[model samples]
Target: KIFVNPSAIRAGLADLEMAEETVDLINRNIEDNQAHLQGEPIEVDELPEDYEYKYPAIKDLKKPCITLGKAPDLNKAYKSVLSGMNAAKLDPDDVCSYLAAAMQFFEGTCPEDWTSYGILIARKGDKITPNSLVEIKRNDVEGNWALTGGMEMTRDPTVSEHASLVGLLLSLYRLSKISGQNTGNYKTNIADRIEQIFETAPFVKIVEHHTLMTTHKMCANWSTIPNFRFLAGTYDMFFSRIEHLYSAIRVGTVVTAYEDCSGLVSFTGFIKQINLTAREAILYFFHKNFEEEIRRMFEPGQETAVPHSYFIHFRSLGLSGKSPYSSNAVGHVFNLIHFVGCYMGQIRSLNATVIAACAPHEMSVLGGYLGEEFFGRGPEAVYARIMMNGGRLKRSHIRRYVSVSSNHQARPNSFAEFLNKTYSS
Candidate 1:
């Protein structure tokens, strides 16, 4: 009798259909919230005349800076989305067409063409290089023009992928906030906007595909690697968001509500998990495919073998930091935190009550878990502690982690160990 390769089972689940189904389920969950918000009107204070919406601009000054624009009736919009998510209806597709659409949108849209509807911008080389940023209004949408200097020189697939993931993460963060509010209006508005973001943005499809593709690769190689336990842990990190989102939607409550602000705390965990997995994946790919380059870059007897210069060159080429040719394995993770901060800041500016009502203890727990689980230090851990205390971490923290080579070798015994240790500490 012939036996089926268990690896085949893993590969099967990573296929396009599985990815489509996963996204479909998640969208359904969001839809439930959307439905709930439709029937309600949330009471929110009028925006202050001096109110200003802010977002982190892209790193490269030469690139047309993308910033966050104030949503028309921003308060009302947020309330609508939040109200929808609070309703909690859950339900459960092809990858090619959607993938093509995503690719086209990312590649075709120039920075200037993006308009000021969701994102704001500042043209490069203006008199107010840093201070005189101008807002791009919704009516300013235009055809793609030749890049002068304000747009990225070339599109990095990795950057686009990262952006998509960040968008999804933001949507979930919004949901988490809604759950914390436990108010009909808040839930309805936030949930409704999340759905709108998905509907309007093509990047969502790219993220779904990238996630599935990454999972597929892990599954295909699941059996060959002797360290099955390590592989399993990484796989769990990759899939945790989908699993958590599903549970949150199915339960129809802030799943993290058991403890104060646990929902946001859990969001941080998901962010850290993704960061960890992406870091490991990049290192593994580099070691596997660019062994000679790795040795050349880090010759024997060098104190800091993987120098900062190496990553600088890696990123200059527009490679995915998650790929073998990439550099600064931790940069994308830092970017994740930055993006989250900008998003939350925008929300706070719109309505301080929403931010204030969120649970801080949940965030504290998340910080403790990150330090203990990832860095093996308690509150003293830089990244985890900063995040817990302030809900943000600086780029210096990422640099500190990367500068120390030994930090990369640290790994938990198993996924179970990691999870158990995370919550217990």
Candidate 2:
């Protein structure tokens, strides 16, 4: 039985109620304003009845469920990742490399901060304890975890939340200055103060925690949620379809996993047709740069065409493309841009899929995507019946005859009833 986070319930309830009331109020106002503008008989009472705002009712919040076994040793699972880092040969103990490594891990998982990307490998006396949640209060100066060994360290760095606050505030201050503004602007002023308070607060200092633990632990629940399946499927399609272009281009070597994951998130968040209208507008502007570059190369009377011989020159040096001069003349800039955009989408989708795959109930939900013809005619009829009964009937009413009708009555068979029982339970 999995215990639900109490905060999730609290927030869910609050959000449900607020959303219901908000939608009701919006509709009511819309009707009222429309009537007032037309000078029609305005009847506030005639406004639509309030909706009984329904949330995705979670039934059997404590349902008997299976946990996929513990995550494989992150370090072991991503040994190649470690090898890539080791190949760089930067001293892990060096503060600069450690910081850079910390940032690299952050970029990989899209974490907003460092601590979330590092784990606390704690120690007591002479023995080291694994998996102990380090109780480093925000004010614990020496409680920060490190990514490297302490052999060269003289003293534990102060782990006060204040240090974090200071760093945070300084970042904001720099941002404000870089933007050619003083803190006097209301938003900037407020941001500065906010960062200052956070800087003044106590925060932990982490060191030596492996990147694997950090990545796994940070987004585990989000990644496990069922709703992300569609997004993941979309990404997988993008990745499988377009990933070969990088090797085809031969400009430089590329990391597949990073490219896949980052590609998905950035693609979905920035490139996809979604709510980010402003960001999309900026992307369109960037698209124009490619258009201009292409126009210059292909358009006649432009900058003198680089000799086709130049392309052949590179081709002779073992480049795969047959027409090296022609290939160079027609740069793959736009092709690369589109490829990267799609790859980002692929990565984002993969991350979502991984998370959804881990969720037990998600399996039943995804099963619905399968064509109904796959189940026999009689089963299809039963499936339809189950879908009709799903929302209106509770678990007991829906499955009342299962015990007498079927020998194995404990579990559900079809997708419709399985989710119905799962949600209604």
Candidate 3:
């Protein structure tokens, strides 16, 4: 789902009407970009002569500096990317590197504001459980199973309906520490809390929880012991590819993870309010939905309910502005696919391909001289299917997004159905 060598990607853009001119422009920028990579650092004017810095300077973090530093002038290079046609996007690996560094920095001495935090139990004494309706009816290629009730998700962070996995992670982190000391009102504002999760370096493939049992028992542990999971790294998030199901589960979202009987399947409804007073992380799985599955998890010879799959509860009502339907978002996905260029397996189902690789931002251009065929047959088909008339999708796709279930057009039964129908048409 990601591409590396720019030379091959560059070749594909070779036939664009303005290819030579744009290539020269992008080539010049890339050549200039090497100045940052191969030689002395670009001067960043800062730091009072007598003043000192608390954390290591960004330049000191060589890896992140390279990946996170000034990106190429993609706009200047492909001016027509302004008019229409597919512009390139950042490398996922590059984005991956930045994300990994964020995880590492936060894991180390994370900064704190007087930002207070902690939680108290809900539903009183029962283990704040994990629950979801496992809709086994996977009529589409993507549906394995998903919680059936909540509305579709809004992916961009700024939107009101957006359910933030990153936003939830911070509270989880703060709640785990200062069990009695940290007070319960540590509410976090998502955009502000957002900055703390990044810096330099990368990587975690954390699996298996080293289960800890709380035994404040004089009947306390057994009577009201709710499960709280603390995570500093990464774990698997299952059933996320339903496209409209949920936001992309990034590193911090999952607290602890449990591999299933098949060594697969994972969760969220999930990251519930953390209750510090009770020393419990509360999660709610609807008994109305998963009574038997809930019973099996905590009762099969044990009582501690570690919320392994409880993070999936963020369902967008679309009452607020929807993020995915915006022009930036539609083009963002279009650009990523054009640049990343899917593999053979991905070509089997382009809908599956789109659901898996979508990222939130446009970082750096993965290719220059982008043209219809340069991205490959798979992407070519995607372009044909998605890019509407006038060789533009900026408005065309968004129009479709706004029109779905609106303007008396027949709404497709599901997002998967919509994609299948859209691409098929």
Q: Estimate each model's TM-score.
A: 0.18, 0.17, 0.17
lDDT of 1 by residue, 1-425 (tens): 11112233233323222222222333343344333233235434321110221111233333221222222332222222222222221100011111111222221111222112122332322222111222222323222212223222233343334334334332342243232222544544544544444434443333222232222222332222222211111112122222322221212122211112112222233334334432221221111122232222222221111211111111111211123211222222222222233222222112211121222223223323343344333223433344345544334433332233122222233212222233323
lDDT of 3 by residue, 189-272 (tens): 221222222211121111111111111111121211111121221212221211222222232232222211100011111111
Candidate of highest TM-score: 1
CA error at residue 55 for candidate 3, angstroms: 28
Candidate ranking under lDDT, highest first, comes to 1, 2, 3
Clashes of each: 27, 32, 20
Cα displacement (Å) at residue 40, model 3: 38
* Alpha-carbon shift of residue 253 in model 1 (angstroms): 21
Q: Where does the lowest 10-residue lDDT sum fall in candidate 3?
A: 261-270
Off by over 4 Å in 1: 1-60, 63-70, 88-291, 295-425
Predicted structure 3: lDDT = 0.22
Residue-by-residue lDDT tens digits, candidate 2, 379-404: 33423443555413334432432222
CA lDDT of each prediction against the hidden true structure: 0.26, 0.24, 0.22
